[PDB]
Design a protein around this ligand. Structure first.
Ligand SMILES: *[C@@H]1O[C@H](CO)[C@@H](O[C@@H]2O[C@H](CO)[C@@H](O[C@H]3O[C@H](CO[C@H]4O[C@H](CO)[C@@H](O)[C@H](O)[C@@H]4O)[C@@H](O)[C@H](O[C@H]4O[C@H](CO)[C@@H](O)[C@H](O)[C@@H]4O)[C@@H]3O)[C@H](O)[C@H]2NC(C)=O)[C@H](O)[C@H]1NC(C)=O
Ligand SMILES: [Ca+2]
Ligand SMILES: [Cl-]
Ligand SMILES: [Cl-]
Length: 435
């Protein structure tokens, strides 16, 4: 069984679209008119109020603020969402602050206000709608598919993917933001996002779990050239009995994926990803510092990563801030102690730079013997720059200090050594100096 929608072609319920374990019931997408896909174009010149453009009548494009000499990024929302006065339109607005771009929001809110397994079908029609438009740009205006960027969140990512497939993966870039897990994880490449969908496919995983048991809406499966798992991928900082998942698609963790990206538009290197097999390995500092070439910048500037498409499923782990701009930079801090007696307290250290200076961070807790070296990695929320000096602090009667403190910048690998012969009483900020 199949349905056809004029120029958008035919859609069948044959495997793997339906009638499979993950998609038991044989559904077919709604009509284009019932899904009501709308392309809302934002521009530097019209950042707040969209212009409505269609591929059916590409005189609408000419009339609009679309520019050929400019890059073009699509933003596709997911299940039970919209674009108007929401995060897609808010995201465009960020982009105008750093670049010149045709921002196109794909709004299919009516087709996304459906039972979920219906939305998973409707996306196909939305995906066609998009490609039909993307092809019109090439056909009517000679616009290159390399300049097209498609950013999709959740179902939006597989919608993105669908359009990418429809165009034989010629579209310049797809960015999948916590791509929807239910009805995609472990399924064939035809129906989900995968590296073949665009020249460059980069994915931010934030609410990831396997299908059994389900503990999130994201894919744990790696589906890009680059796959980022900030904070482990399962639970983001800031976010027995009957288990209710009746609103998972609006989980804080799940929505955090577009929050990071939006932030990365304005804070380019606030989210550096480190090459790593597991989050544990990263937590334990095996994936530090950045490779010589450099780290990929997770988010809007991922396209600058040297060798971004040399391999598929290149895993990256990083840590982010818990709130606000969400930015974070990684540091490995080594401190070796001095004193004349072993005290039972704990160590704090501060970073002092050219830009500003950090708060105090805990480094060790328990037995504090002299000569003892203690290493710890820390998450600083801002780029301190060149570390001019450091400060050591301890608290529980006698004197204690730090003789050497080593700080290694995750980003550029740079290693800073600091020294002092002093030892201090509890709570006194001893300051070390370059050596
Ligand atoms: C997005 O994310 C973050 C928002 O949460 C931003 O990170 C913040 O950056 C600032 C520096 O730009 C950090 O530093 C400020 O605070 C430190 C230390 O504060 C500590 O001691 C205080 C005791 O009074 C307490 O109030 C604090 O809780 C904490 O324990 C201060 O030393 C600085 O203020 C003073 O010092 C410098 C001199 O170097 C002067 O410039 C100031 O005028 C002032 O005299 C800093 O203002 C801040 O801590 C940090 N926030 C967190 C939670 O980490 C981030 O910058 C932001 N934006 C961007 C662009 O990324
Ligand atoms: Ca695909
Ligand atoms: Cl406007
Ligand atoms: Cl609203």
């Amino acid at each position: 069984k199949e349905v056809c929608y004029g120029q958008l072609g035919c859609f069948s319920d044959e495997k793997p679209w339906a009638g499979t374990l993950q998609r038991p019931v044989k559904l077919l997408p709604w009509s284009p008119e019932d899904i009501d896909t709308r392309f809302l174009l934002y521009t530097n010149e019209n950042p707040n109020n969209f212009q409505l453009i269609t591929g059916t009548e590409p005189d609408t494009i000419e009339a609009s603020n679309f520019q050929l000499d400019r890059k073009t990024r699509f933003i596709i929302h997911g299940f039970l969402d919209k674009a108007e006065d929401s995060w897609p339109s808010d995201m465009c607005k960020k982009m105008f602050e750093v670049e010149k771009v045709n921002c196109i929001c794909v709004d299919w809110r009516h087709g996304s206000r459906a039972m979920y397994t219906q939305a998973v079908q409707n996306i196909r029609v939305v995906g066609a709608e998009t490609a039909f438009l993307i092809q019109a740009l090439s056909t009517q205006l000679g616009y290159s598919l390399e300049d097209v960027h498609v950013i999709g969140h959740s179902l939006g990512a597989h919608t993105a993917a669908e359009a990418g497939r429809r165009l034989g993966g010629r579209v310049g870039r797809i960015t999948g933001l916590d791509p929807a897990g239910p009805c995609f994880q472990d399924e064939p490449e035809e129906v989900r996002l995968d590296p073949s969908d665009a020249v460059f496919v980069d994915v931010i995983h934030t609410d990831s779990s396997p299908i059994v048991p389900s503990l999130g809406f994201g894919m744990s499966q790696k589906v890009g050239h680059l796959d980022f798992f900030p904070n482990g991928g399962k639970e983001m900082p800031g976010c027995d009995g009957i288990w209710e998942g009746i609103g998972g698609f609006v989980s804080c963790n799940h929505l955090r994926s577009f929050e990071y990206y939006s932030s990365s538009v304005l804070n380019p290197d606030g989210f550096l990803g480190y090459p790593c097999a597991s989050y544990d390995e990263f937590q334990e500092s095996k994936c530090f510092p950045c490779p010589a070439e450099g780290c990929p910048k997770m988010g809007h500037y991922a396209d600058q990563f040297k060798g971004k498409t040399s391999a598929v499923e290149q895993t990256f782990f990083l840590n982010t801030g818990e709130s606000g701009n969400f930015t974070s930079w990684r540091y490995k801090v080594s401190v070796t102690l001095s004193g004349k007696e072993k005290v039972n307290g704990y160590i704090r250290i501060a970073l002092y730079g050219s830009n500003e200076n950090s708060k105090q961070y805990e480094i060790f807790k328990g037995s504090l013997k002299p000569d003892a070296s203690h290493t710890c990695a820390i998450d600083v929320d801002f780029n301190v720059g060149k570390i001019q000096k450091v400060k050591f602090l301890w608290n529980k009667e006698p004197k204690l200090g730090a003789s050497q403190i080593t700080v290694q910048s995750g980003e550029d690998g740079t290693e800073y050594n600091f020294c002092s012969s002093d030892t201090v009483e509890e709570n006194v900020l001893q300051s070390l100096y370059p050596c």
